[PDB]
Amino acid sequence: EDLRLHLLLNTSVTCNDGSPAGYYLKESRGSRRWLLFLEGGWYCFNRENCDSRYDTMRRLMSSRDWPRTRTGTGILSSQPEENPYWWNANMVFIPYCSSDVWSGASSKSEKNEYAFMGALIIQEVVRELLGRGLSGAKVLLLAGSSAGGTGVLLNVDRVAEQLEKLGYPAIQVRGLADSGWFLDNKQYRAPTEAIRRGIRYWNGVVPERCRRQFQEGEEWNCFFGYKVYPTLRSPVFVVQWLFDEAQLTVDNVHPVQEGLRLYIQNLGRELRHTLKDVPASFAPACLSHEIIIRSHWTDVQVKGTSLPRALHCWDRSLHPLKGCPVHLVDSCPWPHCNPSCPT
Ligand SMILES: O=c1[nH]nc2ccc(Sc3cccc(Cl)c3)nn12
Numbered sequence: 001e002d003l004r005l006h007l008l009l010n011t012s013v014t015c016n017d018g019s020p021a022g023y024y025l026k027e028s029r030g031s032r033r034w035l036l037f038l039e040g041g042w043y044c045f046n047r048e049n050c051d052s053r054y055d056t057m058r059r060l061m062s063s064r065d066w067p068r069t070r071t072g073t074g075i076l077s078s079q080p081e082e083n084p085y086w087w088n089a090n091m092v093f094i095p096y097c098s099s100d101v102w103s104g105a106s107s108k109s110e111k112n113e114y115a116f117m118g119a120l121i122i123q124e125v126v127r128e129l130l131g132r133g134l135s136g137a138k139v140l141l142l143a144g145s146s147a148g149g150t151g152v153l154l155n156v157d158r159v160a161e162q163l164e165k166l167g168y169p170a171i172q173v174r175g176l177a178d179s180g181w182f183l184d185n186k187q188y189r190a191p192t193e194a195i196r197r198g199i200r201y202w203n204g205v206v207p208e209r210c211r212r213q214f215q216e217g218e219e220w221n222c223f224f225g226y227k228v229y230p231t232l233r234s235p236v237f238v239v240q241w242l243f244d245e246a247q248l249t250v251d252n253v254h255p256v257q258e259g260l261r262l263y264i265q266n267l268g269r270e271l272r273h274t275l276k277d278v279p280a281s282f283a284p285a286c287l288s289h290e291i292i293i294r295s296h297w298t299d300v301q302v303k304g305t306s307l308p309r310a311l312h313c314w315d316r317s318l319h320p321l322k323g324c325p326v327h328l329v330d331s332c333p334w335p336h337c338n339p340s341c342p343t
Pocket of ligand 1: 040041042043101145146147148150180182191192195223224246247
């Protein structure tokens with residue numbers, strides 16, 4: 001219970017149902033590193049499935065039932081044994097209560113049953129943290145898992161622009177996108193259409209350079225890592241299982257015969273291909289989902305290097321390095337051909 005809840009002082013920045021959004025914070029006095037983690041949890045894209053989500057996933061739509069505290073785990077842990085990378089950092093967990101992949105900028109109003117304010121929640125958390133010590137940071141790492149990982153891609157450059165415009169050009173903003181790098185591929189038997197509708201429902205916003213490439217009606221393209229990443233200017237480290245369970249779910253993949261074997265192998269090859277020119281990346285050949293906030297996140301290795309090590313090497317690279325790599329993508333072609341994959 002080491003991160004304490006703060007509801008936003010600007011109570012017009014809200015979760016889906018109009019309750020205040022917020023953040024959980026564990027300060028580390030003397031550390032100038034700040035980790036802001038975006039929670040995941042899918043999304044909803046119309047009145048009817050947002051209503052269903054409100055019935056049975058209400059904590060993802062409302063702060064009314066949030067606990068006072070949360071325990072930091074994985075990269076949010078303050079214990080060096082659990083978090084070799086950033087155990088001494090200031091830790092922020094931002095709950096996902098906007099159901100918009102962190103893209104929304106619309107209030108609950110006369111014509112809107114729900115508010116979709118994910119992009120504004122991030123901005124407001126940053127602005128309020130500046131009064132709590134973020135003004136002295138030297139690195140702000142915006143991290144996130146699943147929908148939160150896509151949220152990092154959609155928001156990291158906006159955080160960088162926000163701090164520049166507020167007068168803090170010395171704070172280095174970086175992104176860590178975990179399990180948010182998806183392919184708009186052929187299904188084995190769809191997201192792009194749900195996101196297209198969601199964006200219109202949420203008044204969703206995407207990074208400016210990506211928006212200018214794809215133009216009106218095509219902003220859904222910017223939710224796909226391999227298309228939005230080249231447009232970003234902040235350093236972003238990408239963590240993605242080659243056989244991500246959520247990717248397989250949307251691909252309608254649930255004794256494996258030839259067609260499915262080739263499908264799975266091609267998925268891993270395509271994912272690996274999209275990471276070829278991503279210099280900071282960690283992509284193990286495993287069937288799994290998420291990594292960075294799991295307590296055993298230290299266990300997986302690619303080519304003998306763990307993710308906490310790769311992230312440390314990335315920090316050093318931002319001050320190639322002898323024995324301290326940052327681009328770690330498996331080349332073996334089948335789930336769990338890497339022996340360190342989670343069980
Ligand atoms: O939170 C979780 N767990 N698994 C998943 C899978 C997709 C998403 S949002 C998303 C991201 C990119 C593209 C699209 Cl079309 C949708 N969120 N998510």
